[PDB]
Amino acid sequence: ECSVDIQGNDQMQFNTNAHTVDKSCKQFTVNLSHPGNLPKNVMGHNYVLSTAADMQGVVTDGMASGLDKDFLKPDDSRVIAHTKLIGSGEKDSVTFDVSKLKEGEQFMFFCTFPGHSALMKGTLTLK
Ligand SMILES: [Cu+2]
């Protein structure tokens, strides 16, 4: 009860816009996959986690940081956890410590590829 599977597709969609993390999990695992046909250079996706209020800046700086940095600013302390940027036929998992989430905050997940974040975003709720 401490993982979730998510897909990103060739139509710039995740197949969820919300998941939970139970507060009794010590670690939580996100398993991202790209079952499309377009490569990462034109339709790459990542799962990037931050507070809801930090998502905009993570995205802005990330899009400006280069494909070769997976569209994340180096040493961006607002990023709680993330997967790699993946393309067709690839998958990547991230396991993180739930202690990184505070029960007082609200959290969102998103993709930082150029143009994808307003389409590819969702809520993570710690319950
Ligand atoms: Cu994307």
mmCIF file of N, CA and C and ligand atoms in Angstrom:
data_model
loop_
_atom_site.group_PDB
_atom_site.id
_atom_site.type_symbol
_atom_site.label_atom_id
_atom_site.label_comp_id
_atom_site.label_asym_id
_atom_site.label_seq_id
_atom_site.Cartn_x
_atom_site.Cartn_y
_atom_site.Cartn_z
ATOM 1 N N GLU A 1 0.775 -1.251 0.000
ATOM 2 C CA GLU A 1 0.000 0.000 0.000
ATOM 3 C C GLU A 1 0.791 1.276 0.000
ATOM 4 N N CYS A 2 2.003 1.193 -0.570
ATOM 5 C CA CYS A 2 2.928 2.298 -0.658
ATOM 6 C C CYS A 2 3.567 2.469 -2.030
ATOM 7 N N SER A 3 2.738 2.242 -3.067
ATOM 8 C CA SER A 3 3.190 2.524 -4.440
ATOM 9 C C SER A 3 2.008 2.856 -5.311
ATOM 10 N N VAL A 4 2.330 3.440 -6.469
ATOM 11 C CA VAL A 4 1.349 3.772 -7.509
ATOM 12 C C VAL A 4 2.047 3.663 -8.839
ATOM 13 N N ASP A 5 1.288 3.183 -9.798
ATOM 14 C CA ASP A 5 1.723 3.086 -11.207
ATOM 15 C C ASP A 5 1.092 4.179 -12.022
ATOM 16 N N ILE A 6 1.846 4.918 -12.780
ATOM 17 C CA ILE A 6 1.358 6.006 -13.587
ATOM 18 C C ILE A 6 1.933 5.866 -14.990
ATOM 19 N N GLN A 7 1.150 6.253 -15.996
ATOM 20 C CA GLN A 7 1.563 6.321 -17.401
ATOM 21 C C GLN A 7 1.495 7.746 -17.929
ATOM 22 N N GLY A 8 2.418 8.061 -18.823
ATOM 23 C CA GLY A 8 2.320 9.238 -19.678
ATOM 24 C C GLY A 8 2.235 8.796 -21.124
ATOM 25 N N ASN A 9 1.465 9.528 -21.951
ATOM 26 C CA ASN A 9 1.174 9.017 -23.323
ATOM 27 C C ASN A 9 1.576 9.979 -24.414
ATOM 28 N N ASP A 10 1.267 9.599 -25.668
ATOM 29 C CA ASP A 10 1.721 10.400 -26.794
ATOM 30 C C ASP A 10 0.776 11.578 -27.045
ATOM 31 N N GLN A 11 -0.237 11.739 -26.248
ATOM 32 C CA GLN A 11 -1.192 12.850 -26.292
ATOM 33 C C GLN A 11 -1.022 13.786 -25.124
ATOM 34 N N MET A 12 0.174 13.734 -24.474
ATOM 35 C CA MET A 12 0.479 14.652 -23.360
ATOM 36 C C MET A 12 -0.502 14.520 -22.244
ATOM 37 N N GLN A 13 -0.777 13.307 -21.829
ATOM 38 C CA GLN A 13 -1.624 13.020 -20.684
ATOM 39 C C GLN A 13 -0.980 12.040 -19.738
ATOM 40 N N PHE A 14 -1.127 12.290 -18.440
ATOM 41 C CA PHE A 14 -1.008 11.209 -17.447
ATOM 42 C C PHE A 14 -2.307 10.446 -17.348
ATOM 43 N N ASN A 15 -2.273 9.188 -16.882
ATOM 44 C CA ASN A 15 -3.513 8.432 -16.756
ATOM 45 C C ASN A 15 -4.120 8.515 -15.395
ATOM 46 N N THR A 16 -3.726 9.551 -14.639
ATOM 47 C CA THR A 16 -4.321 9.909 -13.370
ATOM 48 C C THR A 16 -4.157 11.415 -13.091
ATOM 49 N N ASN A 17 -5.069 12.005 -12.323
ATOM 50 C CA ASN A 17 -4.671 13.356 -11.884
ATOM 51 C C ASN A 17 -4.685 13.421 -10.352
ATOM 52 N N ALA A 18 -4.615 12.271 -9.667
ATOM 53 C CA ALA A 18 -4.552 12.320 -8.206
ATOM 54 C C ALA A 18 -4.177 10.976 -7.650
ATOM 55 N N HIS A 19 -3.298 10.964 -6.671
ATOM 56 C CA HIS A 19 -3.111 9.747 -5.906
ATOM 57 C C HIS A 19 -2.830 10.149 -4.449
ATOM 58 N N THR A 20 -2.867 9.133 -3.621
ATOM 59 C CA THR A 20 -2.646 9.284 -2.185
ATOM 60 C C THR A 20 -1.320 8.674 -1.815
ATOM 61 N N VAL A 21 -0.850 9.029 -0.649
ATOM 62 C CA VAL A 21 0.228 8.371 0.118
ATOM 63 C C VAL A 21 -0.328 8.177 1.529
ATOM 64 N N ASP A 22 -0.341 6.923 1.989
ATOM 65 C CA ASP A 22 -0.750 6.726 3.402
ATOM 66 C C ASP A 22 0.350 7.134 4.350
ATOM 67 N N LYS A 23 -0.018 7.860 5.418
ATOM 68 C CA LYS A 23 0.928 8.390 6.398
ATOM 69 C C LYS A 23 1.726 7.330 7.151
ATOM 70 N N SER A 24 1.272 6.089 7.084
ATOM 71 C CA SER A 24 2.051 5.048 7.723
ATOM 72 C C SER A 24 3.080 4.489 6.797
ATOM 73 N N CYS A 25 3.135 4.859 5.515
ATOM 74 C CA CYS A 25 4.264 4.441 4.673
ATOM 75 C C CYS A 25 5.489 5.134 5.084
ATOM 76 N N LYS A 26 6.594 4.401 5.191
ATOM 77 C CA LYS A 26 7.861 5.044 5.434
ATOM 78 C C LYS A 26 8.535 5.494 4.138
ATOM 79 N N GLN A 27 8.343 4.647 3.134
ATOM 80 C CA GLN A 27 8.820 5.029 1.765
ATOM 81 C C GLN A 27 7.584 4.925 0.869
ATOM 82 N N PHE A 28 7.651 5.584 -0.283
ATOM 83 C CA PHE A 28 6.573 5.483 -1.285
ATOM 84 C C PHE A 28 7.260 5.401 -2.647
ATOM 85 N N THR A 29 6.708 4.551 -3.481
ATOM 86 C CA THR A 29 7.276 4.298 -4.825
ATOM 87 C C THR A 29 6.313 4.720 -5.919
ATOM 88 N N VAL A 30 6.809 5.503 -6.886
ATOM 89 C CA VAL A 30 6.027 5.866 -8.107
ATOM 90 C C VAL A 30 6.666 5.129 -9.274
ATOM 91 N N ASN A 31 5.899 4.330 -9.970
ATOM 92 C CA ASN A 31 6.400 3.577 -11.147
ATOM 93 C C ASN A 31 5.831 4.241 -12.384
ATOM 94 N N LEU A 32 6.623 5.029 -13.098
ATOM 95 C CA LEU A 32 6.207 5.723 -14.319
ATOM 96 C C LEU A 32 6.561 4.929 -15.522
ATOM 97 N N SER A 33 5.644 4.869 -16.503
ATOM 98 C CA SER A 33 5.929 4.238 -17.800
ATOM 99 C C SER A 33 5.378 5.071 -18.933
ATOM 100 N N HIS A 34 5.957 4.824 -20.116
ATOM 101 C CA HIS A 34 5.606 5.556 -21.356
ATOM 102 C C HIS A 34 5.264 4.524 -22.393
ATOM 103 N N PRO A 35 3.992 4.097 -22.432
ATOM 104 C CA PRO A 35 3.642 3.028 -23.387
ATOM 105 C C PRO A 35 3.294 3.635 -24.770
ATOM 106 N N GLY A 36 3.694 4.873 -25.081
ATOM 107 C CA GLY A 36 3.536 5.437 -26.435
ATOM 108 C C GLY A 36 4.627 5.017 -27.352
ATOM 109 N N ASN A 37 4.658 5.741 -28.460
ATOM 110 C CA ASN A 37 5.531 5.459 -29.612
ATOM 111 C C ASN A 37 6.455 6.613 -29.964
ATOM 112 N N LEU A 38 6.348 7.790 -29.310
ATOM 113 C CA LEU A 38 7.160 8.951 -29.635
ATOM 114 C C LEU A 38 8.340 8.961 -28.677
ATOM 115 N N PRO A 39 9.519 9.284 -29.132
ATOM 116 C CA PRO A 39 10.687 9.303 -28.287
ATOM 117 C C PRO A 39 10.720 10.489 -27.336
ATOM 118 N N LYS A 40 11.636 10.391 -26.361
ATOM 119 C CA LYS A 40 11.679 11.356 -25.343
ATOM 120 C C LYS A 40 12.005 12.762 -25.871
ATOM 121 N N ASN A 41 12.667 12.814 -27.070
ATOM 122 C CA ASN A 41 13.094 14.122 -27.586
ATOM 123 C C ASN A 41 11.897 15.028 -28.011
ATOM 124 N N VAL A 42 10.771 14.392 -28.291
ATOM 125 C CA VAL A 42 9.565 15.151 -28.661
ATOM 126 C C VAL A 42 8.404 14.915 -27.743
ATOM 127 N N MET A 43 8.436 13.908 -26.858
ATOM 128 C CA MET A 43 7.306 13.537 -26.028
ATOM 129 C C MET A 43 7.873 12.837 -24.792
ATOM 130 N N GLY A 44 8.902 13.457 -24.211
ATOM 131 C CA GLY A 44 9.440 12.931 -22.966
ATOM 132 C C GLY A 44 8.514 13.310 -21.826
ATOM 133 N N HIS A 45 8.436 12.419 -20.825
ATOM 134 C CA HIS A 45 7.692 12.680 -19.583
ATOM 135 C C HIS A 45 8.476 12.356 -18.322
ATOM 136 N N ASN A 46 8.310 13.191 -17.329
ATOM 137 C CA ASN A 46 8.778 12.831 -15.984
ATOM 138 C C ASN A 46 7.657 13.014 -15.022
ATOM 139 N N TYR A 47 7.854 12.405 -13.862
ATOM 140 C CA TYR A 47 7.006 12.648 -12.685
ATOM 141 C C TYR A 47 7.823 13.424 -11.714
ATOM 142 N N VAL A 48 7.484 14.658 -11.420
ATOM 143 C CA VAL A 48 8.214 15.559 -10.557
ATOM 144 C C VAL A 48 7.257 16.014 -9.448
ATOM 145 N N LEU A 49 7.703 15.906 -8.215
ATOM 146 C CA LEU A 49 6.905 16.205 -7.034
ATOM 147 C C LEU A 49 7.403 17.412 -6.314
ATOM 148 N N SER A 50 6.505 18.350 -5.979
ATOM 149 C CA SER A 50 6.854 19.531 -5.180
ATOM 150 C C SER A 50 5.642 19.948 -4.359
ATOM 151 N N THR A 51 5.774 20.945 -3.521
ATOM 152 C CA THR A 51 4.547 21.598 -2.957
ATOM 153 C C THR A 51 3.771 22.224 -4.094
ATOM 154 N N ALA A 52 2.465 22.379 -3.894
ATOM 155 C CA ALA A 52 1.618 22.922 -4.954
ATOM 156 C C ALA A 52 2.165 24.329 -5.327
ATOM 157 N N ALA A 53 2.558 25.184 -4.360
ATOM 158 C CA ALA A 53 2.979 26.528 -4.636
ATOM 159 C C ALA A 53 4.331 26.601 -5.274
ATOM 160 N N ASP A 54 5.153 25.538 -5.212
ATOM 161 C CA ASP A 54 6.461 25.500 -5.846
ATOM 162 C C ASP A 54 6.473 24.957 -7.277
ATOM 163 N N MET A 55 5.335 24.349 -7.695
ATOM 164 C CA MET A 55 5.337 23.686 -8.989
ATOM 165 C C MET A 55 5.681 24.714 -10.097
ATOM 166 N N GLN A 56 5.049 25.926 -10.028
ATOM 167 C CA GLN A 56 5.224 26.892 -11.146
ATOM 168 C C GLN A 56 6.715 27.191 -11.334
ATOM 169 N N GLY A 57 7.427 27.490 -10.237
ATOM 170 C CA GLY A 57 8.826 27.817 -10.389
ATOM 171 C C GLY A 57 9.697 26.653 -10.824
ATOM 172 N N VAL A 58 9.394 25.486 -10.291
ATOM 173 C CA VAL A 58 10.138 24.263 -10.756
ATOM 174 C C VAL A 58 10.012 24.103 -12.257
ATOM 175 N N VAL A 59 8.764 24.242 -12.717
ATOM 176 C CA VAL A 59 8.529 24.161 -14.163
ATOM 177 C C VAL A 59 9.263 25.234 -14.957
ATOM 178 N N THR A 60 9.099 26.483 -14.507
ATOM 179 C CA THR A 60 9.718 27.603 -15.262
ATOM 180 C C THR A 60 11.215 27.350 -15.352
ATOM 181 N N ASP A 61 11.862 27.067 -14.216
ATOM 182 C CA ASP A 61 13.326 26.969 -14.265
ATOM 183 C C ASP A 61 13.733 25.700 -14.954
ATOM 184 N N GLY A 62 12.939 24.646 -14.780
ATOM 185 C CA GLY A 62 13.241 23.370 -15.372
ATOM 186 C C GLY A 62 13.224 23.354 -16.901
ATOM 187 N N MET A 63 12.163 23.965 -17.458
ATOM 188 C CA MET A 63 12.072 24.073 -18.899
ATOM 189 C C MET A 63 13.263 24.811 -19.492
ATOM 190 N N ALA A 64 13.826 25.714 -18.720
ATOM 191 C CA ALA A 64 14.979 26.543 -19.151
ATOM 192 C C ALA A 64 16.316 25.830 -18.949
ATOM 193 N N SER A 65 16.331 24.627 -18.365
ATOM 194 C CA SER A 65 17.601 23.986 -17.948
ATOM 195 C C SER A 65 18.104 23.003 -18.957
ATOM 196 N N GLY A 66 17.373 22.642 -20.031
ATOM 197 C CA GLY A 66 17.885 21.731 -21.022
ATOM 198 C C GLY A 66 17.307 20.387 -20.944
ATOM 199 N N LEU A 67 17.024 19.816 -22.099
ATOM 200 C CA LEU A 67 16.662 18.391 -22.197
ATOM 201 C C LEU A 67 17.688 17.508 -21.552
ATOM 202 N N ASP A 68 18.936 17.808 -21.767
ATOM 203 C CA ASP A 68 20.008 16.951 -21.224
ATOM 204 C C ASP A 68 20.080 16.994 -19.706
ATOM 205 N N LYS A 69 19.384 17.868 -19.042
ATOM 206 C CA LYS A 69 19.229 17.865 -17.581
ATOM 207 C C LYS A 69 17.836 17.415 -17.186
ATOM 208 N N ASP A 70 17.136 16.755 -18.098
ATOM 209 C CA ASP A 70 15.790 16.306 -17.871
ATOM 210 C C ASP A 70 14.884 17.455 -17.465
ATOM 211 N N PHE A 71 15.138 18.633 -18.020
ATOM 212 C CA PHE A 71 14.234 19.786 -17.749
ATOM 213 C C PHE A 71 14.004 19.995 -16.248
ATOM 214 N N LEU A 72 15.090 19.884 -15.490
ATOM 215 C CA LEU A 72 15.108 20.275 -14.058
ATOM 216 C C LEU A 72 16.276 21.145 -13.797
ATOM 217 N N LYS A 73 16.071 22.222 -13.107
ATOM 218 C CA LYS A 73 17.180 23.146 -12.619
ATOM 219 C C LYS A 73 18.130 22.326 -11.720
ATOM 220 N N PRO A 74 19.447 22.420 -11.945
ATOM 221 C CA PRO A 74 20.322 21.755 -10.961
ATOM 222 C C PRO A 74 20.190 22.278 -9.574
ATOM 223 N N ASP A 75 20.236 21.284 -8.669
ATOM 224 C CA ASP A 75 20.244 21.522 -7.260
ATOM 225 C C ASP A 75 19.007 22.306 -6.797
ATOM 226 N N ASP A 76 17.848 21.954 -7.419
ATOM 227 C CA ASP A 76 16.578 22.577 -7.074
ATOM 228 C C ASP A 76 16.012 21.879 -5.845
ATOM 229 N N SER A 77 16.148 22.591 -4.726
ATOM 230 C CA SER A 77 15.689 22.060 -3.417
ATOM 231 C C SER A 77 14.180 22.013 -3.337
ATOM 232 N N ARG A 78 13.430 22.610 -4.266
ATOM 233 C CA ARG A 78 11.962 22.520 -4.190
ATOM 234 C C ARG A 78 11.503 21.128 -4.678
ATOM 235 N N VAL A 79 12.301 20.368 -5.386
ATOM 236 C CA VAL A 79 11.893 19.083 -5.907
ATOM 237 C C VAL A 79 11.982 18.059 -4.795
ATOM 238 N N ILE A 80 10.883 17.535 -4.384
ATOM 239 C CA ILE A 80 10.816 16.550 -3.259
ATOM 240 C C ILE A 80 11.330 15.195 -3.810
ATOM 241 N N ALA A 81 10.894 14.783 -5.001
ATOM 242 C CA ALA A 81 11.268 13.527 -5.598
ATOM 243 C C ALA A 81 11.006 13.626 -7.066
ATOM 244 N N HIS A 82 11.612 12.784 -7.885
ATOM 245 C CA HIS A 82 11.246 12.758 -9.303
ATOM 246 C C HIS A 82 11.738 11.506 -9.930
ATOM 247 N N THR A 83 11.150 11.091 -11.030
ATOM 248 C CA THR A 83 11.696 10.115 -11.916
ATOM 249 C C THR A 83 12.542 10.758 -12.968
ATOM 250 N N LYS A 84 13.307 9.957 -13.689
ATOM 251 C CA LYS A 84 13.925 10.423 -14.974
ATOM 252 C C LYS A 84 12.844 10.776 -15.990
ATOM 253 N N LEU A 85 13.319 11.545 -16.987
ATOM 254 C CA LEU A 85 12.515 11.836 -18.200
ATOM 255 C C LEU A 85 12.602 10.607 -19.059
ATOM 256 N N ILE A 86 11.474 10.072 -19.498
ATOM 257 C CA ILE A 86 11.430 8.847 -20.287
ATOM 258 C C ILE A 86 10.652 9.088 -21.594
ATOM 259 N N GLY A 87 10.948 8.236 -22.557
ATOM 260 C CA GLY A 87 10.232 8.235 -23.847
ATOM 261 C C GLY A 87 9.612 6.892 -24.128
ATOM 262 N N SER A 88 9.052 6.740 -25.361
ATOM 263 C CA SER A 88 8.391 5.511 -25.726
ATOM 264 C C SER A 88 9.173 4.252 -25.329
ATOM 265 N N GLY A 89 8.404 3.349 -24.697
ATOM 266 C CA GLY A 89 8.890 2.000 -24.360
ATOM 267 C C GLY A 89 9.740 1.978 -23.061
ATOM 268 N N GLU A 90 9.938 3.113 -22.399
ATOM 269 C CA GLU A 90 10.765 3.187 -21.203
ATOM 270 C C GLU A 90 9.902 3.282 -19.963
ATOM 271 N N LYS A 91 10.550 3.070 -18.835
ATOM 272 C CA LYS A 91 9.915 3.159 -17.519
ATOM 273 C C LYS A 91 10.976 3.599 -16.530
ATOM 274 N N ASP A 92 10.518 4.187 -15.430
ATOM 275 C CA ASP A 92 11.463 4.566 -14.367
ATOM 276 C C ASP A 92 10.669 4.643 -13.089
ATOM 277 N N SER A 93 11.246 4.186 -11.988
ATOM 278 C CA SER A 93 10.640 4.263 -10.656
ATOM 279 C C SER A 93 11.404 5.157 -9.724
ATOM 280 N N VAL A 94 10.721 5.841 -8.863
ATOM 281 C CA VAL A 94 11.372 6.606 -7.781
ATOM 282 C C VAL A 94 10.754 6.162 -6.457
ATOM 283 N N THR A 95 11.630 5.853 -5.488
ATOM 284 C CA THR A 95 11.215 5.567 -4.114
ATOM 285 C C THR A 95 11.737 6.639 -3.258
ATOM 286 N N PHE A 96 10.935 7.312 -2.427
ATOM 287 C CA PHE A 96 11.320 8.423 -1.589
ATOM 288 C C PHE A 96 10.785 8.224 -0.181
ATOM 289 N N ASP A 97 11.434 8.974 0.717
ATOM 290 C CA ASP A 97 11.052 8.892 2.139
ATOM 291 C C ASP A 97 9.849 9.765 2.371
ATOM 292 N N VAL A 98 8.840 9.163 2.975
ATOM 293 C CA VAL A 98 7.615 9.947 3.215
ATOM 294 C C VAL A 98 7.806 11.083 4.189
ATOM 295 N N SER A 99 8.821 10.983 4.993
ATOM 296 C CA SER A 99 9.194 12.081 5.879
ATOM 297 C C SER A 99 9.423 13.413 5.109
ATOM 298 N N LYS A 100 9.652 13.335 3.787
ATOM 299 C CA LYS A 100 9.854 14.527 2.995
ATOM 300 C C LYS A 100 8.589 15.255 2.740
ATOM 301 N N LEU A 101 7.462 14.648 3.001
ATOM 302 C CA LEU A 101 6.155 15.271 2.859
ATOM 303 C C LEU A 101 5.639 15.764 4.276
ATOM 304 N N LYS A 102 5.301 17.011 4.491
ATOM 305 C CA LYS A 102 4.670 17.294 5.773
ATOM 306 C C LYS A 102 3.131 17.261 5.692
ATOM 307 N N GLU A 103 2.496 16.591 6.675
ATOM 308 C CA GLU A 103 1.069 16.669 6.796
ATOM 309 C C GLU A 103 0.537 18.146 6.747
ATOM 310 N N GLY A 104 1.310 19.185 7.098
ATOM 311 C CA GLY A 104 0.666 20.480 6.802
ATOM 312 C C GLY A 104 0.596 20.949 5.372
ATOM 313 N N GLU A 105 1.473 20.439 4.514
ATOM 314 C CA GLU A 105 1.520 20.936 3.119
ATOM 315 C C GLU A 105 0.514 20.336 2.132
ATOM 316 N N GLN A 106 0.392 20.933 0.929
ATOM 317 C CA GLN A 106 -0.212 20.313 -0.227
ATOM 318 C C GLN A 106 0.810 20.226 -1.365
ATOM 319 N N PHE A 107 0.608 19.138 -2.094
ATOM 320 C CA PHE A 107 1.624 18.620 -3.033
ATOM 321 C C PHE A 107 1.030 18.403 -4.414
ATOM 322 N N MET A 108 1.820 18.651 -5.424
ATOM 323 C CA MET A 108 1.420 18.301 -6.792
ATOM 324 C C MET A 108 2.570 17.581 -7.477
ATOM 325 N N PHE A 109 2.196 16.719 -8.388
ATOM 326 C CA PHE A 109 3.065 16.027 -9.312
ATOM 327 C C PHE A 109 2.855 16.610 -10.717
ATOM 328 N N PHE A 110 3.829 16.591 -11.582
ATOM 329 C CA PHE A 110 3.749 17.181 -12.905
ATOM 330 C C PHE A 110 4.915 16.718 -13.765
ATOM 331 N N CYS A 111 4.777 16.969 -15.058
ATOM 332 C CA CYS A 111 5.839 16.818 -16.027
ATOM 333 C C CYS A 111 6.452 18.162 -16.370
ATOM 334 N N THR A 112 7.797 18.237 -16.459
ATOM 335 C CA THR A 112 8.414 19.519 -16.785
ATOM 336 C C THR A 112 8.864 19.651 -18.282
ATOM 337 N N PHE A 113 8.538 18.650 -19.103
ATOM 338 C CA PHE A 113 8.861 18.834 -20.532
ATOM 339 C C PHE A 113 8.136 20.122 -21.017
ATOM 340 N N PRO A 114 8.807 20.921 -21.879
ATOM 341 C CA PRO A 114 8.177 22.104 -22.444
ATOM 342 C C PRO A 114 6.750 21.876 -22.957
ATOM 343 N N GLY A 115 5.813 22.708 -22.437
ATOM 344 C CA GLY A 115 4.438 22.620 -22.943
ATOM 345 C C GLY A 115 3.542 21.592 -22.249
ATOM 346 N N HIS A 116 4.118 20.718 -21.383
ATOM 347 C CA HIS A 116 3.313 19.562 -20.846
ATOM 348 C C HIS A 116 2.713 19.877 -19.531
ATOM 349 N N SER A 117 3.249 20.785 -18.730
ATOM 350 C CA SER A 117 2.802 20.844 -17.258
ATOM 351 C C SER A 117 1.408 21.188 -17.038
ATOM 352 N N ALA A 118 0.816 22.089 -17.821
ATOM 353 C CA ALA A 118 -0.582 22.441 -17.501
ATOM 354 C C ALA A 118 -1.502 21.301 -17.884
ATOM 355 N N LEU A 119 -1.120 20.439 -18.828
ATOM 356 C CA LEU A 119 -1.879 19.272 -19.172
ATOM 357 C C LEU A 119 -1.574 18.095 -18.133
ATOM 358 N N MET A 120 -0.322 17.976 -17.820
ATOM 359 C CA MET A 120 0.219 16.797 -17.080
ATOM 360 C C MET A 120 0.564 17.209 -15.642
ATOM 361 N N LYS A 121 -0.444 17.196 -14.828
ATOM 362 C CA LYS A 121 -0.263 17.620 -13.427
ATOM 363 C C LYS A 121 -1.323 16.972 -12.636
ATOM 364 N N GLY A 122 -1.152 16.830 -11.327
ATOM 365 C CA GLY A 122 -2.110 16.209 -10.445
ATOM 366 C C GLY A 122 -1.764 16.479 -9.001
ATOM 367 N N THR A 123 -2.573 15.958 -8.115
ATOM 368 C CA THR A 123 -2.389 16.141 -6.653
ATOM 369 C C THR A 123 -1.856 14.872 -6.003
ATOM 370 N N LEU A 124 -0.935 15.043 -5.052
ATOM 371 C CA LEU A 124 -0.570 13.944 -4.162
ATOM 372 C C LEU A 124 -1.092 14.350 -2.783
ATOM 373 N N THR A 125 -1.889 13.452 -2.181
ATOM 374 C CA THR A 125 -2.472 13.775 -0.832
ATOM 375 C C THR A 125 -2.021 12.756 0.184
ATOM 376 N N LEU A 126 -1.480 13.266 1.268
ATOM 377 C CA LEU A 126 -0.929 12.448 2.325
ATOM 378 C C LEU A 126 -2.064 12.302 3.276
ATOM 379 N N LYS A 127 -2.522 11.054 3.460
ATOM 380 C CA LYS A 127 -3.745 10.717 4.294
ATOM 381 C C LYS A 127 -3.400 9.769 5.444
HETATM 382 CU CU CU B 1 5.544 15.210 -20.395
#
